[PDB]
């Protein structure tokens, strides 16, 4: 393959929670994604969810279009049995290990992609829980973190910090879950993270948090933790198939390589 | 308890819910992974109902109004 070109990991964020597309721009977006994905996005009752899903899809296609140089119209995205987006086996892809993943919680849709490292991502906004109080919420969530994890979570007198740590510990678990592609069906209590360092500054990728699966350290797993802003935590779980801050994209970035896929339809 | 419907609305981050088709699925209303865990833990403790993920995803709010009335 003459036009080789060494590929590097991608870390993109898009603030969909403050993206306010016009009828025209949405329709642009909607036509730029795959038919099945259109219909789905169009089933979401709320802008919040539809925009996230949409930002997610536009970002994957951008990533493949740009990094794999497949013309957007010919990007064949699919999904594993358990719902993970994957690129079709038929290549335009001499990166057999090239994989990616998105998350969309809070105001952002984030995406990681790597050429070799198999990867999972999860973003989480520290927001007051939708039902009940924090303590109540944490109660509802007991069965999902280890005692040591909870001691760390309640180790802070401020319930916002507590929530911060909870969402962090959660995101770390999802990144891994999404990395391995398994779904909700994975007893999250099997996973214990040693959250390190406790206090994370914005504008920095922390690689120090190590994981224990079933009490044995999962030494084959790196975790990249950042706060893309003061309120969103992002975990990127990286396994070997055996520095880079997130880049805030805007709409035109998302569409830069877009070609319309589905026809005109009122 | 009686209005579990609200409790899961609030879990979904929906408020009022007067402006929500009760026939919308929880998926369509934006059920997160976290939300999923909450809703499922709520229907356990409140309704003694353990639901598949698929079940919870396809739960309508009307289908909730049904499941609390029955008691
Ligand atoms: C989606 C899922 C795996 C995780 O849910 P979550 O942490 O609340 O949602 P996130 O925003 O972090 O992840 C959603 C994205 O993960 C990806 N995804 C879906 N299923 C996945 C899975 N089995 N493993 C890894 N990623 C998955 C998709 O791109 C999905 O985006 P989409 O639902 O807009 O199409 C859920 O099905 C469990
Ligand atoms: Mg698509
Ligand atoms: Mg770029
Ligand atoms: Ni409440």
Residue numbers in the entry:
A (entry chain A): 18 to 259, 276 to 299
B (entry chain B): 2124 to 2194
Show passages lifted from the paper:
The posttranslational modification of a conserved serine residue in carrier proteins with a phosphopantetheinyl moiety transferred from coenzyme A through the enzyme phosphopantetheinyl transferase (PPT) is vital to all living organisms. Whereas microbial genomes contain more than one PPT, only one PPT has been identified in mammals.
For the PPT-CoA-ACP complex, the packing within the crystal lattice is different, and this region is no longer visible in the electron density maps, indicating inherent flexibility. Surprisingly, in the PPT-CoA-ACP complex, no density was found for the Mg that is sequestered in the active center of the PPT-CoA complex. This may be explained by a water molecule that coordinates the Mg in the PPT-CoA structure, which is displaced by the Ala side chain (substituted for the Ser2156) when complexed with ACP.
